[PDB]
Amino acid sequence: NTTQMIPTYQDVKTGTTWLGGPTHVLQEQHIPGYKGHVKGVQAESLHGKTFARITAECLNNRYKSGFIVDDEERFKTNYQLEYIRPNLRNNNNRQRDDEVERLELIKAQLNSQPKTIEDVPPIDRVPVIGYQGFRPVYRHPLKQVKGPTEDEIDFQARTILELTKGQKEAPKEIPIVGYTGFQKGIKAENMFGKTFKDLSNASNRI
């Protein structure tokens, strides 16, 4: 954990240490060749991260101790920790943020033209001239449509506006194509014809 804090953004630009840097001015090190017990090398079996880098983690009191790991502190794949973007040299994708916005907006607009409250033209009140069907004799011959209740349409507007530059975050973060994971009930519920990439939104959203 030495790397991401040391060479801090105050160190590179108009600063002393460069990217690699003789990072012994900032903290206490021991210049390789040395014998002793730094109190944190032999006990915790820290891997890689050449001896010099190990020291800084030793005295600065960052550590992580205890035979029993605090759930999260053990539940990482070392793949993730090693290859974590570029971080500190000099200072994710907004994708799927528009996808949700591109998602509901399609939902809302289709919900903005149901012809609420007898707004349909004079035609279409009864079925087409050629209809067959039942047409029960003792029923109000015309059709009745309830439609959205004003506030329902306005409710969608707030979410649409809120998502665009709002507190709402990207929904989950999803895999690419072929991940063979459970995906949270893609089968337990059929969810058959839904454009596999879109399934993740259907999967994790629940």
Binding site: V12, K13, T14, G15, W18, L19, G20, R89, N90
Partner: protein, 202 residues
């Protein structure tokens, strides 16, 4: 020797600019050039951009090298590279058109180095010039009647340089761009004098 501390510390920075070449002929007046300036070791670079179907052989025009201004006879430093200024290279003359959004953040990052970048020093630069007019508010009042002859509430750059230079005040182009770029509400190069005026007075 070769600067050792210079290479290791300030290596990463890389500035990118777009420009246009000035020469004797019409031949290459409309084609564009992109200039890359490595501040790690003060090496200038020339890159060529060629539009599709234009028929010009796209590629590299000048290899990165090191050469100097004949007049002042001092190697290139970061000071000379500024918006609107003209840098002399070899037997050509190039002009800087626009800056890289990466650059500006680097451009505005270090005041005391690129003074024209410091926003605060820009307005006052114009402010200290208002001493000639007797009444301070008169300098306020005349401005609205000079830069904007129609008092439309919005102006464009091409008139602003002529409008300002019309009075006679001397501002190096690198100051002019910084002011207008601040007041563009929608980021389309449209000044808001009121916002400028409000800062100037209210």
């Amino acid at each position: 020797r070769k600067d050792i501390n210079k290479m290791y510390t300030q290596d990463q920075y890389i500035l990118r600019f777009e420009g246009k070449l000035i020469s004797q002929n019409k031949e290459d007046n409309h084609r564009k050039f992109i200039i890359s300036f490595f501040c790690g070791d003060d090496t200038i670079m020339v890159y060529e951009t060629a539009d599709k179907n234009s028929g010009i052989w796209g590629g590299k025009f000048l290899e990165r090298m090191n050469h100097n201004n004949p007049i002042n006879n001092k190697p290139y430093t970061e000071l000379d590279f500024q918006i609107g200024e003209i840098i002399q290279l070899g037997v050509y003359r190039f002009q800087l058109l626009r800056a890289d959004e990466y650059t500006h953040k680097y451009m505005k990052s270090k005041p005391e180095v690129f003074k024209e970048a410091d926003i605060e020093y820009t307005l006052n630069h114009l402010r200290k010039f208002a001493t000639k007019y007797k009444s301070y508010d008169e300098f306020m009042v005349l401005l609205i009647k000079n830069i904007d002859p129609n008092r439309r509430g919005v102006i464009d750059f091409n008139d602003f340089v002529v409008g300002l230079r019309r009075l006679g005040y001397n501002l190096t182009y690198q100051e002019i761009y910084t002011l207008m770029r601040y007041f563009d509400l929608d980021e389309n190069w449209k000044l808001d004098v009121k916002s400028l005026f409000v800062a100037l007075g209210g």
